[PDB]
RNA sequence: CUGGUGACUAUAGCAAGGAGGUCACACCUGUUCCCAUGCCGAACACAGAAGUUAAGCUCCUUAGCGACGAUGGUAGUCCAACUUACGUUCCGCUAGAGUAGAACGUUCCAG
RNA sequence: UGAUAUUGAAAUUCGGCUUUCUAACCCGCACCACUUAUCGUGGUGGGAGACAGUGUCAGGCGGGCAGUUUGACUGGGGCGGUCGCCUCCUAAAAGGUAACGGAGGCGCUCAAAGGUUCCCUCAGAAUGGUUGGAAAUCAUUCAUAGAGUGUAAAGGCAUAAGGGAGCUUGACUGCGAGACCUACAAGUCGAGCAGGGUCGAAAGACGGACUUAGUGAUCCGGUGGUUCCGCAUGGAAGGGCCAUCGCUCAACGGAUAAAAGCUACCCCGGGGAUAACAGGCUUAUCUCCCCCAAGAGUUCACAUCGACGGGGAGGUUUGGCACCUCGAUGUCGGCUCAUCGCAUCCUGGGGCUGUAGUCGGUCCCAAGGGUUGGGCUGUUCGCCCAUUAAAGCGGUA
RNA sequence: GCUGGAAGGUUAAGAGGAGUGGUUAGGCGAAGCUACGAAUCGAAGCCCCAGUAAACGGCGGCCGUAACUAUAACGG
RNA sequence: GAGGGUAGCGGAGAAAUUCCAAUCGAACCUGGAGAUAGCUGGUUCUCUCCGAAAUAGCUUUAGGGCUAGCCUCAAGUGAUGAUUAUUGGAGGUAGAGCACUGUUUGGACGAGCGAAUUCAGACAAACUCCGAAUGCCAAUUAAUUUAACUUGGGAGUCAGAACAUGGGUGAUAAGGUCCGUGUUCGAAAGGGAAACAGCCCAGACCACCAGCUAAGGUCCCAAAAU
RNA sequence: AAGCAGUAAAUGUGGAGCCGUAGCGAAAGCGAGUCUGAAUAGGGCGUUUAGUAUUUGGUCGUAGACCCGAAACCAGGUGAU
């Protein structure tokens, strides 16, 4: 039931991540605050 | 042959590529310039007939692995950042 | 006319790795275990999987810590 | 013969009975003031004339249950001889028993 | 079976399948000439006709024919079962260690079941109750953890790793002294430094989860980013590098993108490293003897019979093992000729009787000599007919 | 398996040339030349509709019950 | 009877895998050709020094191969090797025990009274409040000893056997089978066990009509006490 | 080295060519330093750095490759006395 998800930056340089996800428990795209290597600061992700 | 087990080269992956326009140079450190006369003019045409450079591949580049010990004027294609620092410190002047 | 058994997992090399009174370095493994059968002491850390390692250079010392409990420590050599 | 804070395998415990104080610990009467409860100003923290050793807490006594336990034997056992189960020489249990034991105690605050 | 070339006309017709006409092409059709032979060529009639036949391209059917594949372990081989990873016992108090030895589990899950700060503490509850086949809920004491800890087991955890309540995304980027493990490839732990941060008053903690299973080279292809290369030059097409994806490749170190059976018609190279017959070791099973005496036999354990349980001998049965023989040790039942053991079928000599006599039962000593002829089945066995003083049992490849 | 049939579904070359890229005369970019493309038209065959066994092949199980008292002519 | 026809990716067959020049499930001759063989057999003179393995991991792998482990020859670095005494530590086997999880004998006490109460007596590879003898890791500690390690050249080995001892398996059967530990054979002559690779004593450089011993022996065969 | 002159002598000529003196990186490139990285912060591989030509011995590779031996496969021919 779980799936692989990739997190990209929000309208800036893309420094992606990879995690897991449950479709039913979270039927919509998620958002988190991660590190952006290019920008050198915390930034919100999605997808 | 490993008797049936996968060979090491098959296990490992390939890497890199080759460039068709690869240019190489014949290096000559500041140590091989201690035989010419003081103030003489050194030119690739001379280094290939004096006995320092046996085969000039694509030009002569002068490096700085050592001291010059003389004041000369050198003519080459490329100079190391430290080769010209010590060539102009003992007198004279280099040129491309 | 068949067997239902016959399975087993690879053996892990658990136990102590250095002896008491021996000289070690800053990152030497001292004891591999499941859980905490021996507790860390002075200048000792517990790894993620309960592995005990030193943090400085000195002699190893296995001592008792309370009734029915053991620890391991490291003291700099003078 | 006190309070505070540490060191050590309960020989530091559990019980049972006794004694003691308003200088200190507690109990203690309040919820306007900061903060707190998935009923209880119950706990947490508080604002603080009195009321009292009944318990918390202590220094004193008692070996009842737990705890600590040599000496001497026994089982087992390394080595070496016989031979299969018996000799010899080092180590040395468990259990049980005579027994210890109702703590020892650094720095520290004021007496 | 379609498209197109060879291949040209006319009309019907809600860049066209179809009636339609001669001129290409076709006729083992007729009459003539070469030629008093009809193979062939040529000419004139007839038939057919832009079809057929022929070339290239495409789709389907195709053991008719061809090249090949069809695993290993295994108390012989088949059949059955098994193949990777995790935990425990066997394992002989370091680590490591086998069998088709004894027991289970895995091919995940969780956006809070993660990080941080402050709080808290469980089963079972000798009794009371709005009294519902004593155990839902509430109340007070016994309570050495007998509760829990996503999921097997074993080591750990009440200084909590177990429960609840607030804010959070460190389930971060670039690495990394030194160690464990180890044939290789892989796997495991890690102080500390720089860049960002979250929680806390602050020390300080944080590079997922109490710990250990939840996974698979490379080669090739896809999707993003980018310092780089890009055939004379400037671009491009294609490559390199970083991130990531797609395999019950489960025979799980994975032969290829793609694979099943029979041979009594059989062949070659090897093995007693490995079966069928005889020998050998073994004695479960088999055959034959003993111990105890509860009871059957009118009374009466012991004339004779012997439940429950126990101890031996023999090496004739069916097996276990795989030590000799696979550059070869020929089967079953007879026939012919015998030999030898005694656990004695007959003949000889003795006890005891539940022995009147005539006949028997059982047991001891005795191996000198004897121990039939036929019917039915290939037989051994076995049954039957008629006899005999008796129609004994075993060994010798 | 063979024979006949046609309503529809699916399906090759070939025909068809929307539209998207790489180049440049003058972040756009008309032409020319170039590397690739879709709507739609393309037959048999196979799914479908029938017929054929002196074609290949196949032709049941458990209960109770007499005027046939063991049995089961009958019924479930 | 004579003269003719059909030829091996083929002929012939009133059909048997039947025949095609004395062996046809696919004729004969020459060539590719010294096809290939992880399988058998064979492999030629002499001395000197040293001297194994029959194990692990992976394998379309199991009587084959590869790396590691044991052998040998050189060049190097220096007590880093081995045994013993002593002081330290880690680790739950033998035995023992019933405090936990089980299994289980005989009584006593009324909560429905032989195993979640009490008084006695037992049992366990997957039970432990306890717990050895040994072995193992250390201390540039002490004495006696002679190795050890690194780099490079060349190998062989991957079928093992019996005896003692701690275990599984089988039936507390096997000269059975699979692991731990030591010895011998393998590759080891000599003496003893009548004969007898694995048992006991003991390791052959050569020669001698010299002596002392081990295992085992001393009436005769037959050296030694009637 | 080929070639040229020499007795099939093995000498003289012949300097295209090969190895060494400098590494690091996939590459552009830089250079006693280079790669990774925002950062000589740390780490990896180098600065240890003698070489080269001929030849005896040992081993390996491509050729039948220490010797003898198949059951078979394909090609072109000879046979119905
Ligand atoms: O039903 C039976 C099954 C096989 N049996 C058999 C046999 F009868 C003889 C021998 N052998 C082998 C050896 C070589 N003999 C031969 C003969 C031909 O080839 N080799 O000599 C023998 O005795 C064998 F092993 C058996 F299993 C017994 C009878």
From TrEMBL, chain A:
Gene Ontology molecular function: structural constituent of ribosome
Membrane-spanning ranges: none
Top-level taxon in the UniProt lineage: Bacteria
Gene Ontology BP annotations: translation
Keyword field: Ribonucleoprotein, Ribosomal protein
InterPro entries in the record: Ribosomal_bL33, Ribosomal_bL33_CS, Ribosomal_bL33_sf, Ribosomal_zn-bd
Pfam families membership: Ribosomal_L33
Gene3D superfamilies given in the database record: Ribosomal protein L33
Entry GO CC: cytoplasm; ribonucleoprotein complex; ribosome
Entry similarity comment: Belongs to the bacterial ribosomal protein bL33 family.
Entries under NCBIfam families matching the protein: PRK00504.1, PRK00595.1, rpmG_bact
Protein name as catalogued: Large ribosomal subunit protein bL33
Record organism: Staphylococcus schweitzeri
TrEMBL record, chain B:
Superkingdom as given in the UniProt entry: Bacteria
Gene Ontology molecular-function annotations: rRNA binding; structural constituent of ribosome
Biological-process GO terms, alphabetical: translation
Domain Large ribosomal subunit protein uL15/eL18: 27-93
UniProt subunit comment: Part of the 50S ribosomal subunit.
Entry similarity comment: Belongs to the universal ribosomal protein uL15 family.
Protein name: Large ribosomal subunit protein uL15
Recorded name of the encoding gene: rplO
TrEMBL record, chain C:
Family listed: Belongs to the bacterial ribosomal protein bL27 family.
Gene Ontology biological process terms, A to Z: translation
Name the UniProt record assigns to this protein: Large ribosomal subunit protein bL27
Lineage per the UniProt record: Bacteria, Bacillati, Bacillota, Bacilli, Bacillales
Residues in coiled coil: none
GO cellular component: cytosolic large ribosomal subunit
Any one GO molecular-function label of the UniProt entry: structural constituent of ribosome
Key words of the record: Ribonucleoprotein, Ribosomal protein
């Amino acid at each position: 039931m779980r799936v692989n998800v990739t997190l990209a930056c929000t309208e800036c340089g893309d420094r992606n991540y990879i995690t897991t996800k449950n479709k039913r428990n979270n039927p919509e795209r998620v958002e988190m605050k991660k590190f952006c290597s290019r920008e050198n600061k915390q930034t919100l992700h999605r997808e | 042959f490993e008797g049936g087990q996968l060979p090491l080269f098959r296990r490992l992956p390939k890497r890199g590529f080759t460039n068709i326009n690869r240019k190489e140079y014949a290096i000559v450190n500041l140590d091989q310039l201690n035989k010419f006369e003081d103030g003489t003019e050194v030119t690739p045409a001379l280094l290939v007939e004096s006995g320092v450079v046996k085969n000039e591949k694509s030009g002569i580049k002068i490096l700085g692995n050592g001291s010059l010990d003389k004041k000369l004027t050198v003519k080459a294609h490329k100079f190391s950042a430290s080769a010209a620092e010590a060539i102009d410190a003992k007198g004279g002047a280099h040129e491309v | 006319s068949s067997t239902k058994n016959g399975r087993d997992s690879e053996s892990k090399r658990l136990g102590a790795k250095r002896a008491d009174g021996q000289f070690v370095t800053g990152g030497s493994i001292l004891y591999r275990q499941r859980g905490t059968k021996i507790y860390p002491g002075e200048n000792v850390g517990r790894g993620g999987d309960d592995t005990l390692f030193a943090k400085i250079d000195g002699v190893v010392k296995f001592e008792r810590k309370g009734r029915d409990k053991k620890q391991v420590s490291v003291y700099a050599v003078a």
